[PDB]
Amino acid sequence: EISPPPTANLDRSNDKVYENVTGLVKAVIEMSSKIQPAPPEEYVPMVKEVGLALRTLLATVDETIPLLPASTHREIEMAQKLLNSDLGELINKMKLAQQYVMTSLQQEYKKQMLTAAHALAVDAKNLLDVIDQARLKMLGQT
């Protein structure tokens, strides 16, 4: 049920009860979000968090490419494109999942959306590894 925000007449800087209530409410909220299948309308905002994380990573990689050997650029740049490829797929299977909300396809497109997301994480790790090999190659310094 609904209640007003906690009283403003008490200092919370060292309020352990308040911190612990907070902790417990978050653990419950987190537990229910995992146990329950998120409503198709939550897809968009979840996908937005993943997109922001991706461009923050792509911007950073662009700031790193210049500082690396010319011979590593092509492979790195290709790794980046595979990621945008995974994002397009993700975004598109999301919209499809949302399209057929109450049909025999909702679950299948949802699965394909999850597979796209999974690929995006696998390919991010492979990018890190391609970047590390480039960095280590650069250290070819005596």
DSSP state of 104: S
For residue 17, the tally of other CB atoms under 10 A from its CB is 8
User: Per rule CB under 8 A, is residue 14 in the interface with its own copies?
Assistant: no
Contact set for its own copies, span 67-126 (CB under 8 A): 110, 113-114, 117-118, 120-122, 124-126
Contact with its own copies (CB under 8 A): which of 14, 34, 71, 140?
34
User: Per rule CB under 5 A, is residue 25 in the interface with Cl ion?
Assistant: no
User: Per rule CB under 5 A, is residue 19 in the interface with Cl ion?
Assistant: no
Q: Which of the choices Cl ion, its own copies, none does residue 41 contact, using the CB cut-off of 5 to 8 A by kind?
A: none
User: Per rule CB under 5 A, is residue 23 in the interface with Cl ion?
Assistant: no
Q: Which of the choices its own copies, Cl ion, none does residue 130 contact, using the CB cut-off of 5 to 8 A by kind?
A: none
The Cα-based distances of 88 to 46, 64, 92 in angstroms read 15, 24, 6
What residues have CB less than 8 Å from 129, skipping those under 6 apart? none
142 exposure class (CB count in 10 Å sphere: 0-12, 13-18, 19+): exposed
What is the Cα–Cα distance from 133 to 129, expressed in whole angstroms? Answer: 6
What residues have CB less than 8 Å from 68, skipping those under 6 apart? 76, 131, 134, 135, 138
Which residues contribute to the site for its own copies (CB under 8 A)?
A: 1, 3, 6-7, 9-10, 16-18, 20-21, 23-25, 27-38, 42-43, 46-47, 49-50, 53-54, 56-57, 60-61, 64, 110, 113-114, 117-118, 120-122, 124-129, 131-132, 135-136
Q: Which residues bind Cl ion (CB under 5 A)?
A: 6
